[PDB]
Design a protein around this ligand. Structure first.
Ligand SMILES: CC(C)(C)c1ccc(N(C(=O)C2C=NC(=O)NC2=O)[C@H](C(=O)NC2CCCCC2)c2cccnc2)cc1
Ligand SMILES: CC(C)(C)c1ccc(N(C(=O)C2C=NC(=O)NC2=O)[C@H](C(=O)NC2CCCCC2)c2cccnc2)cc1
Ligand SMILES: CC(C)(C)c1ccc(N(C(=O)C2C=NC(=O)NC2=O)[C@H](C(=O)NC2CCCCC2)c2cccnc2)cc1
Ligand SMILES: CC(C)(C)c1ccc(N(C(=O)C2C=NC(=O)NC2=O)[C@H](C(=O)NC2CCCCC2)c2cccnc2)cc1
Ligand code: NA
Ligand code: NA
Lengths: 301, 301
């Protein structure tokens, strides 16, 4: 047993990470087949970044303007185009380490693994949820742009995130691999802020089931509630509404524990009102909301 | 910014993980060069669990009693020997993916990345610390034995842990890669229990410095403390003694933040007396002790 926040093994993705240099800017790119994907702001000087015309900046650019390096091997750029906020560099070499993959856009509340990278070199890996406000609470520094987020389902790597910027609250925003931002953000140096976040209700419940399955049971009670009443509780505490779909998705855990979702909701109601006040569940004094039901099942059975 | 329990990219280790089968028992082994390392308890039966005589059980084995798969490739065992609690199977194929590597025995408080594996197939990656009571708080199901923990500093993978068993309290015990258990544990089914655990004080201070580095100062105070007075107080909260070695180790973080180590110790004293009063530090409502001073500099730079 035990329950830990746990990333997918990153090896299939490490073999895809390259360094992309345009001018004085170096960041990371994703090398799949014979194309390298990276954030389009790689072409931007500091003054360009305040109000960039990417159409016209890229038009002033050429193939030789981009340096791509995989390990200590330079890949030659034979073409370049822009899709939304993502730059696509055609190289003269198909990545022989290209995994079975697809580009996927993840839903708020769902999790993925982040491979943090610097100068094309993988540095660390951790799990993130797509927050309801479309940010992720990552760990990224100078040079991490181009780092990617992914899931793995039977040797298929599903890429869902590319890192573009840090927000003033220290949370992070990026795009899917087709260059569409998650959230109302732009790849420009301008005043931007995360919206007030909310807590992913179904994930907190999934995590309470994980705590029960692992012997943590003190918060259980004989009481059950209704969706209508709880969701009124959820509003007061900036919790997402719980739908019938959410209750269904937790079906497995409710069966495994004999605690119905509305009965677990009654437990959740009680914790929201009183507060942790220092006491712990699964070694946390917060209600953790970045574990999905799948994440729990994949780990507690 | 951001601060996260961050694992090392697992790719270099995934290419070394194999499946070892003996009798009806299957677990994981570590394939480096022409040797596969695995827990020696792969050779016990249901009647050998309480007081196995490992030397006697091993002498009755032929090389072909051992089945080793790498992916779907069979490796042929051409030799075997036992070193402490680890079995070393020689195979006719040196692993072509063997990284630069080395075996290290770690001390309590040190962290490492765990690649959880089942049936030779890597499953997830997460961070652990060696607790002062020589267990680790992992996430392991049956079939995870032989999963390894490691650090990666400049392409050299240092292996420091191989998983052997779950203890009654849900925590985990294993050996270094020379087969010597961490702690007083034995690879027998006999009644064993972890000693009472304590908090890794040097790590909590490192993490407090990490919080300052990411711009949080609310928990500092105008007080200082002697090393001895801090220890007298901290051990009333089941914290490990802080030694001069620890103080020396925090020197670089002390310098980077401009907060003397004993001033930080005064802040920790107060946090233990007060709690968080509804605030958080780097996302947590408790005092986190599984980031080392080295991990902090790694992640914050
Ligand atoms: C395709 C070419 C021939 C261009 C190539 C192949 C391998 C490397 N890689 C080396 O390490 C080298 C091997 N031989 C050399 O001569 N130079 C190198 O750089 C990296 C590597 O395989 N990482 C593994 C990936 C699986 C998990 C563990 C780490 C690498 C691979 C892809 C992107 N980035 C880095 C570089 C280039
Ligand atoms: C606002 C200034 C100009 C100070 C800035 C610029 C770039 C960075 N970023 C870097 O990577 C750096 C590159 N060169 C440097 O010298 N310093 C850096 O920090 C990333 C990032 O926010 N980019 C966006 C891209 C869209 C427009 C706004 C910036 C970043 C940093 C930390 C964590 N995640 C991502 C940080 C700050
Ligand atoms: C050396 C031999 C020839 C014995 C070999 C080579 C490759 C495989 N591996 C396959 O996946 C296969 C490829 N071709 C096949 O025909 N059969 C396979 O199983 C796994 C693999 O490469 N993992 C990578 C490792 C770096 C991170 C990303 C994933 C693998 C490698 C080592 C241990 N265990 C599994 C199996 C065996
Ligand atoms: C004897 C009992 C029944 C108590 C037992 C046997 C094996 C396991 N272990 C398995 O992996 C299983 C294999 N076959 C099964 O049927 N159930 C299992 O749990 C691992 C483990 O503790 N081994 C030690 C090795 C030295 C001797 C004592 C056990 C394990 C399990 C969970 C997490 N980490 C490691 C757990 C318990
Ligand atoms: Na690379
Ligand atoms: Na394998």
């Amino acid at each position: 047993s035990g329950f830990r926040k746990m990333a997918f093994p990153s090896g299939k993705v490490e073999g895809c990470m390259v360094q992309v240099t345009c001018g004085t800017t170096t960041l990371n790119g994703l090398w799949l087949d014979d194309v390298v994907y990276c954030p389009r702001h790689v072409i931007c000087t500091s003054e360009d970044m305040l109000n960039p015309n990417y159409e016209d900046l890229l038009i002033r650019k050429s193939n030789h303007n981009f340096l791509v390096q995989a390990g200590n091997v330079q890949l030659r750029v034979i073409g370049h185009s822009m899709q939304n906020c993502v730059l696509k560099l055609k190289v003269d070499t198909a990545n022989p380490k290209t995994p079975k993959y697809k580009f996927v856009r993840i839903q708020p509340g769902q999790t993925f693994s982040v491979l943090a990278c610097y100068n094309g070199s993988p540095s660390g890996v951790y799990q993130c949820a797509m927050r309801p406000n479309f940010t992720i609470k990552g760990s990224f520094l100078n040079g991490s742009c181009g780092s990617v987020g992914f899931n793995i389902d039977y040797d298929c790597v599903s890429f869902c995130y590319m890192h573009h910027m840090e927000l003033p609250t220290g949370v992070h925003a990026g795009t899917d691999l087709e260059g569409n931002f998650y959230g109302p953000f732009v790849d420009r140096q301008t005043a931007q802020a995360a919206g007030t976040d909310t807590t992913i209700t179904v994930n907190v419940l999934a995590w309470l089931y994980a705590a029960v399955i692992n012997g943590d049971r003190w918060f259980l009670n004989r009481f059950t509630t209704t969706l209508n009443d709880f969701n009124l509780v959820a509003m007061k505490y900036n919790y997402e509404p719980l739908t019938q779909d959410h209750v269904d998705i937790l079906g497995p855990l409710s069966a495994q524990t004999g605690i119905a979702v509305l009965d677990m909701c009654a437990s959740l109601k009680e914790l929201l009102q009183n507060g942790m006040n220092g006491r712990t569940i699964l070694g946390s004094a917060l209600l953790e909301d970045e574990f999905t039901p799948f994440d729990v099942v994949r780990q507690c059975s």
